[PDB]
Design a protein around this ligand. Structure first.
Ligand code: P02
Lengths: 238, 244
């Protein structure tokens, strides 16, 4: 019941943004580069470790251990969902898009069932190893913020962020393409006068998915569905 | 932390194989091993075997997800798409390039090194306890009067150890390169039990194919050593394959 990895067993490698490592195969290491952790740096570490060690799911990033500040997880080869959708030459077929949506819904459903709120769900936090949800959370990111988020964070907030991810999948683009100033999005979305353009969705997009999307993007936090129903709907049409 | 899944949360589906293994629905696809059973004496006997699976967080080890007490005792893991290394090698006949074979061997070395690092002895490593998820990722499971082909001589005749696992791995290496089971020439369990046990029978290395790294064949022999002590450990088993 100790996920403390004795330091010196890990061979850290190239920088990523976090290092690629070697422990009992390929691993991904997060090194907190400080002389001595502040009291704030300490609780941040415990909390991420505490919530990571309660996850055992195929669609959640595999936490492998910690070191005392370091967090060891599985190495994921490939790029994030952000790269593939926005900064990539190659697009995806619908069957794959719906598949990416389903796995993410499974992971999000798993977390919510464990009383865990990601509080930072976005296409950049979704690694396409097989969907892998990482970069945790408790138990630039403005585009994925619910109107009440601009305590605001809840299961409903994750539901909204999930809705934007759906929008990315079904359109390929980021929301609010006609805006280059962050302060107005904050104002317009925050007030309740701005919403993603669901007319941008592909012709291939099932009306079912387009409906579900609008539900997750509801202006009022309480009209948004729950992942048990979100997964049910996605699983059905698939 | 309790990893117990409350009664009713899992929807058991089709029987896969014989406890008994089923495919289920729990936050997605899962696998349920229904134990052939509860008695309060066996109740705590069940948790011991779970509190060991509880310390496996590795990509090459089958992902343990939770356990059940009601209705009956069950082990819950991830669901693996595709068949076993056994089926690929001796049934599907799927042609693997030498490139992939080494990687499968490499991943299995990673998984086994990790287990031994956790001081866990598998006691039964064979090509049908190794599942090729997505036909790419190796998943070692089923470690929590049958298959003797992977049994070391000291096991046939503290007989279970890290070196006995190493032997089973050598047989696996044999399967990967030879594309077939050892002692296929001889169809007699009692003969193999007798001859391997006394040390007069060993795998035929004339059947491994030409495209085989001579470090790997040399590595096979090290694991297939009839003498327990003459076998290399998994850190070194993995280091050499990795370098190779
Ligand atoms: C972590 C490993 N332990 C929890 S274990 O020793 O109980 N390992 C464990 C746990 C649950 C199921 C199985 C399993 N067992 C199978 C045999 C060959 C023994 C009948 S197939 C199979 C399986 C698991 C997942 N997907 C598919 N398609 N098949 C398993 F090995």
């Amino acid at each position: 019941d100790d996920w403390e990895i004795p330091d010196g067993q890990i061979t850290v490698g190239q920088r990523i943004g976090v290092y690629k490592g070697k422990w009992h195969g390929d691993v991904a290491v997060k090194m907190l580069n400080v002389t001595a952790p502040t009291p704030q740096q300490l609780q941040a570490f415990k909390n991420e470790v505490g919530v990571l060690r309660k996850t055992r799911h195929v669609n959640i990033l595999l936490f492998m251990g910690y070191s005392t500040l370091a967090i060891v997880t599985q190495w994921c080869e490939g790029s994030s969902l952000y790269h593939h959708l926005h900064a990539s030459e190659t697009k995806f077929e619908m069957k794959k898009l719906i598949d990416i949506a389903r796995q993410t819904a499974r992971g999000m459903d798993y977390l919510h069932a464990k009383s865990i709120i990601h509080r930072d769900l976005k296409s950049n936090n979704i690694f396409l190893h097989t969907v892998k949800i990482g970069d945790f959370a408790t138990e630039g990111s403005i585009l994925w913020m619910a109107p009440e988020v601009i305590n605001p964070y809840s299961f409903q907030s994750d539901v909204y962020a999930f809705g934007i991810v759906l929008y990315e999948l079904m359109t390929g683009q980021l929301p609010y393409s006609n805006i280059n100033n962050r302060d107005q999005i904050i104002e317009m979305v925050g007030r309740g006068s701005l919403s993603p353009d669901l007319s941008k969705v592909r012709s291939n997009c099932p009306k079912r998915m387009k409906r579900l999307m609008a539900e997750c993007l509801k202006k009022k936090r309480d009209e948004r569905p729950s992942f048990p129903r979100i997964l049910a709907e996605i699983e059905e049409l698939a």
